[PDB]
Design a protein around this ligand. Structure first.
Ligand SMILES: C[C@@H]1CCO[C@H]2Cn3cc(C(=O)NCc4ccc(F)cc4F)c(=O)c(O)c3C(=O)N12
Ligand SMILES: C[C@@H]1CCO[C@H]2Cn3cc(C(=O)NCc4ccc(F)cc4F)c(=O)c(O)c3C(=O)N12
Ligand SMILES: [Mg+2]
Ligand SMILES: [Mg+2]
Ligand SMILES: [Mg+2]
Ligand SMILES: [Mg+2]
Ligand SMILES: [N+]
Ligand SMILES: [N+]
Ligand SMILES: [Zn+2]
Ligand SMILES: [Zn+2]
Lengths: 184, 368, 368, 184
DNA sequence: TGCGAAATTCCATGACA
DNA sequence: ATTGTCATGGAATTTCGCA
DNA sequence: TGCGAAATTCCATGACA
DNA sequence: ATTGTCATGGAATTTCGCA
């Protein structure tokens, strides 16, 4: 069986609803399976149409052989099926209530939820502008399993933005009370 | 004056005036019988005025000016006095064309890595499409990989919006552009400083310098044109298709697509190359490093038979960028301060500001 | 189809498919093990479709199209099928650039006599001067003698007004112009027929053909510019001065002024040549006939290494004169009817009209 | 003494008043002394200013060494003197009431007065447009004294408009009554 | 029948949109 | 059915002045 | 160890205003 | 303080297939 490569499998998922930022509410999250490389896209809804619109941007740079997703309505619609078939992309769904990814992807998703949370405190509404820096952070984060960042694996070079500060990623006791304030 | 011309009349020899000819007075003027005819030798004190009158009839150069003078006069070393005036005629110097070519072009080394250097530039205005008129084109120096962004104006704000999206993927060491308003604004400089990106600017009015991206325009417009044949020019929806199409096109001299040079493996596009199917990613990346360094590099062409190359201290003139009708095509003479490379110089203009300038926008001031 | 590919599988030999290679079935497709890798041999009935899919990704030419196909397939003589498609892609044929130069320029004989041939052309719009915006420039072919008329528009009526004044002096056999509206109108044709003047037209969009007069523009504007330095561009009052100045200027290669070539003697202008003072007019005119025939004539330069010359029956394409944004730069292929000379041809367009056309506005249709 | 040449001497003179044609009333007449070549210029008046304006056109083609004229006010004004001095042209006047030209010039003037007269009958008001054809006729007229037309002597070639019909130039008995009508 | 320098000729370059 | 041209100003080559 | 033909490489040409 | 580039499609050259 052939070694795993970038573009073999894109894992896509929605995060949100979030506090509105520049009129956006959700993040479509795309993670390359082999590299751990992450792309993020703000959307106004977890619809097939917002999904197609975002993936059209991404697929003008790279087309995955397979897209893997849970059974979100956006992903199981017949429109989304047509879209994938047109591009020769095989669709693949995890069984309902049992999301399977890979360790790498699950841990990546984890980093994303945690990193977003850490940055949205104090500024729950300014996340739109932070999406670029989030991705750079995520893609220049050192992977313990391989010796390389997703950037290094995708492009085969060092990056000009190494995030040499491996971050706290935990919410300082201050911010824990700040977050427990926004829910009041 | 009349001093020199006196000794001449009484048959004594003065340096310059050959002895084998008969010099005489007639009609109150010193004359001489030269093979072509009888010419007046004016006094040295008169000569400059004569050359100037003759030159000024039509502001003619060496031979055409000489031929007028020679109709009535002879004196020793006439062309030397003609050339003196040509080098002092401000109108001739700033209006005439050069007849010396630039020295042969440099072929700067391909950037070593993807993201080492971006070349950026606008195309447009194009026919309105979804309210969009311009395309920001970003070309990665090493790979040729190109990104296309539709804009409404070639502005800083539109540039920043597009590059914020692109730099999501990676931040480049350098961004090279021409001197368009969008790229030279302090807002854009700030935007780059914030990200540790160095802004590099082309010498002004020399699109060769942005040649990596300029050349990509031609491929972009060409493919848009073919796709739009016999349809209305709805190009906005085609940018993504064109971007993808060009990034996955082979350059015959390199034998690779820009996508390949950036990722080392084709994505799921038609006719994907499969040669590294059995290699590990790591093996693949290692073969990619090797492919990247062994790419063809063009060499500096031979100089043309009559080129000039700049020298520190030389008088040279900058081309007027956008000359008005009936106005000179050249600025006043200025001095070469530093020769940055054989095709690029800093000049002191006469204002005097330091200006970094392409040799192609320069002529060597004629007649020293 | 599956016919040819069958004999191949059982180890028999078909022309084109070299025998020293192992051909087999796998995944329902005919394959082969070639040095570079394992490629699919599609049935002949499939090939055209494949070439077309590969070509159409970015409408690429020979090598770039081949390199896509070669990623997945092999069959005998692949480029031949690629080239077939390139020659049938209407979009490529009308959009791509030529990479063949025109054959070397003709240097037509100088007209034998003053007034044998006038070359005329407009300059402008210039900055308004006394309400005037254009200059009609008339150049006598043999002598270079030039007449300048200020106009308000580049119109027939203004052209007729000016030429009525000029032809007071002499009527020319021929008047050569480009295809500007002023010179192609039936009113202007009538005006010339009335006077026994033959109208000769340049091939369209080829100012080289009017080169005798075009070149004079540069001298005119150049002298206007110098005279106007640091003043407002009040050029109208200077036309007479410029006309006179240029007509009495020496051409260094000829060693004569156009005034001299027209009259055989200088008028009362500065630095008048006096060499024929002792000759009779008749002696003067006789020396002038001799000077006129012994003038320098340039020769056809060497062809560039990759030029084409037209051949009766050849498919060729006319350059679109003023192509809209994102629209093809070339018309559909047309056929060479007659080769008037090595740089000029009549073509049948596809409409089909006869059109007389410069080789410089033509490319030979690629891929036959 | 040196042989006679074109541009040695221009003989200038006014003809008119004439019937108004396109608002013009006079013709300034310029005849080259050596060649017999004629230039005509319509003016609104025999003033120095109309003279300078016309001669500026001519002198942008050829400058005469000498201008010869009678003692017309236009020609003897100090403005006209300045104009000539600026161009290095020597002015020369015939003595009052005794016009001296040369035979060639006098005969040329004669041809002009007669040719104009022949053409202005029936159309006394359309002479402006005829000035070009008048000059061509005049300059391609065979000279009995030399074997050549003024065109031939000026340019040293045959012309493309030979006036091979040596004209009547006399007024047919019809036109004599037509001219004796316009005076009524 | 030869030298150094001046004069003349050669011709690449660019520009007429 | 028509078609490049030629000022410019260093360099190359020739001619001049003198012996 | 050499032939005819195919494949590959060379590179002038023109175009990004 | 900076710097031309590269698709194209015939021609030239090299390599292949076979002996
Ligand atoms: C509206 C008519 C209809 C026909 O086409 C246009 C456009 N045109 C263009 C040029 C021009 O591009 N000159 C630059 C040039 C380029 C090369 C060369 F060898 C000589 C040169 F002078 C003219 O000179 C010109 O007269 C016209 C013109 O009259 N028209
Ligand atoms: C307003 C800014 C300020 C600076 O100048 C202008 C004008 N400009 C002109 C061209 C242009 O002439 N391209 C043709 C081209 C010519 C030769 C070559 F080798 C490559 C080539 F692409 C550009 O591409 C371009 O970007 C600009 C531009 O941005 N601006
Ligand atoms: Mg630009
Ligand atoms: Mg550009
Ligand atoms: Mg024209
Ligand atoms: Mg023109
Ligand atoms: N370099
Ligand atoms: N010819
Ligand atoms: Zn000058
Ligand atoms: Zn095509």
């Amino acid at each position: 069986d052939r070694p795993q490569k970038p573009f073999d499998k894109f894992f896509i998922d929605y995060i949100g609803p979030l506090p509105p930022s520049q009129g956006y509410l959700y993040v479509l999250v795309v993670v390359d399976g082999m590299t751990g490389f992450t792309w993020l896209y703000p959307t106004k809804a977890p619809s097939t149409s917002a999904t197609v619109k975002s993936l059209n941007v991404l697929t003008s740079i790279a087309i995955p052989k397979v897209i893997h997703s849970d059974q979100g309505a956006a992903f199981t619609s017949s429109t989304f099926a047509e879209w994938a078939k047109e591009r020769g992309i095989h669709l693949e769904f995890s069984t309902p209530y049992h999301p399977q990814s890979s360790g790498k992807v699950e841990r990546k998703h984890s980093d994303i939820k945690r990193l977003l949370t850490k940055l949205l405190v104090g500024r729950p509404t300014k996340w739109y502008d932070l999406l670029p820096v989030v991705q750079l952070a995520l893609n220049n984060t050192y992977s313990p399993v391989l010796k390389y960042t997703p950037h290094q694996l995708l492009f085969g070079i060092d990056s000009n933005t190494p995030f040499a500060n491996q971050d706290t990623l935990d919410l300082t006791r201050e911010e824990e009370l700040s977050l427990l304030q926004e829910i009041r | 004056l009349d001093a020199e011309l006196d000794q001449l009349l009484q048959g004594h020899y003065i340096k310059g005036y050959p002895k084998q000819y008969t010099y005489f007075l007639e009609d109150g003027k010193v004359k001489v019988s030269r093979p072509e005819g009888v010419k007046i030798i004016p006094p040295q004190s008169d000569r400059q005025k004569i050359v100037l009158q003759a030159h000024n009839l039509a502001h003619t150069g060496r031979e055409a000016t000489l031929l007028k003078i020679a109709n009535l006069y002879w004196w020793p070393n006439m062309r030397k006095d003609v050339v003196k005036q040509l080098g002092r005629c401000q109108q001739c110097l700033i209006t005439n064309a050069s007849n010396k070519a630039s020295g042969p072009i440099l072929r700067p080394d391909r950037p070593q890595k993807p993201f080492d250097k971006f070349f950026i530039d606008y195309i447009g205005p194009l026919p309105p499409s979804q309210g969009y008129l311009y395309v920001l084109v970003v070309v990665d120096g090493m790979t040729g990989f190109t990104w296309l962004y539709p804009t409404k104006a070639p502005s800083t704000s539109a540039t920043v919006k597009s590059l914020n999206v692109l730099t999501s993927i990676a931040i480049p060491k350098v961004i090279h552009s021409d001197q368009g308003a969008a790229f030279t604004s302090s807002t854009f400089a700030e935007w780059a400083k914030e990200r540790g990106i160095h802004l590099e600017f082309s010498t002004p009015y020399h699109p060769q310098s942005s040649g990596k991206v300029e050349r990509k325009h031609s491929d972009i417009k060409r493919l848009l044109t073919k796709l739009l044949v016999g349809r209305p020019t709805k190009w906005y929806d085609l940018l993504p298709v064109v971007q993808l199409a060009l990034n996955n096109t082979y350059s015959p001299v390199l034998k690779y697509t820009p996508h390949q040079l950036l990722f080392g493996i084709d994505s799921n596009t038609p006719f994907a190359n499969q040669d590294t199917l059995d290699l590990t990613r790591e093996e693949e990346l290692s073969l990619l490093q090797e492919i990247r360094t062994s790419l063809y590099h063009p060499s500096t062409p031979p100089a043309s038979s009559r080129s000039w190359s700049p020298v520190v201290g030389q008088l040279v003139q900058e081309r007027v960028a956008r000359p008005a009708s009936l106005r000179p095509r050249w600025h006043k003479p200025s001095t070469v301060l530093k020769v940055l490379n054989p095709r690029t110089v800093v000049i002191l203009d006469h204002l005097g500001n330091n200006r970094t300038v392409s040799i192609d926008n320069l002529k060597p001031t004629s007649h020293q």
